[PDB]
Amino acid sequence: STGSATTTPIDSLDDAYITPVQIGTPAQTLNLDFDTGSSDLWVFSSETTASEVDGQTIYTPSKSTTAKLLSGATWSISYGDGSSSSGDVYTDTVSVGGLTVTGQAVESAKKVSSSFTEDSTIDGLLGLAFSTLNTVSPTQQKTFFDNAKASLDSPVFTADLGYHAPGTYNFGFIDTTAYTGSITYTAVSTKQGFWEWTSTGYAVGSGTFKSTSIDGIADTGTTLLYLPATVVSAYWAQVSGAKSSSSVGGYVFPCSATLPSFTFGVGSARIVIPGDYIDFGPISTGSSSCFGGIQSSAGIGINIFGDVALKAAFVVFNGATTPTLGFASK
Predict the structure, then answer these.
(1) 4 catalytic per annotation
(2) Are 200 and 187 in contact (CB under 8 A)?
């Protein structure tokens, strides 16, 4: 089997992407944030504290003839941005882009933090990291990908995120029309539960490539590109007036600037992030100070190849017995 679903930016900045997901019988369609940096499929639901729901579409398990309470199971998750959610668990039928999994753990939120409530466009998350990170207790549950894998034509999914435009998540096949040149594959460590890999270096604008190993995660659920302070300083030093602002919470730059590109290495291959991808707009409405899309990972404890980086590539998440990651230009 295969599946193919369009993923759409939630706003003009590409802060996140939503993908429609069918849950239950009859189908209830919710727009979920596909997150390769976590491993829980959770939804706003009829059980979510009413004051914490503001415009989201909810899953109502009592209206699904295939929903079953997973007795005794609870979940609770906290994300890198400080947001969180928790609740109980159902199993139900879940379909993405024509690919169907029966018996998928659908984690129903009883509580969500303010950031979730405040974002009316995201109805929940669909985790695509390794199932070892799944938070369901006392019986850990498998991701949608893990459940689907054996049935897929090939044990892979791909992320093709758009810049200010829709893109695609495919399951079970590689669309050879969706990228240019060749796909370069690189080793993955699953030791921390992430799609963790080592970039071979970077360049700023038309500058020379610096060969240096940068360990980080491919994380579709993180907006920006977080890299070591040395790398980030080298980037922003090429932008007149750019500075790190403790008050704002990162590098800012004059909105009048034209940003240089940023290149990252994948083996001997190179992925170029155009400068415009690195512009996240005014820090506050009407400001002429703009927020940078490349930020320091210092004090995160991990480098993160978030959407800024991933949307410059066609990315293969290869879930074969020894997982790997592939990157192509597009």
Answers:
(1) no
(2) no
Distance CA 209, CA 202 (A): 6
How determined?
Answer: X-ray
Task: Answer positive or negative: Cα dihedral of 296, 300, 303, 308.
Answer: negative
Q: To 10 degrees, the CA torsion angle through 43, 80, 193, 184?
A: 100
Domain 175-330 has CATH 2.40.70.10: yes
Choosing from 199, 261, 296, 297, the catalytic residue is 199
Beta bridge partners of 316: 158, 326
Identical fold at 5-174 and 175-330?
A: yes
| Residues linked to residue 280 through DSSP beta bridges, in sequence order | none
Specify the resolution in Å.
1.3
**Of 35, 119, 146, 307, which one is the catalytic site residue?**
35
Helix %, strand %, coil % of the chain (to 5): 10, 45, 45
Q: Is 199 a catalytic residue?
A: yes
- Structure token pair of residue 102: 């029966």
Strands 167-171 and 184-187: unpaired
Query: Do the Cβ atoms of 14 and 21 come closer than 8 Å?
Result: no
Q: List the chain domain ranges.
A: 5-174, 175-330
CATH class of 5-174: mainly beta
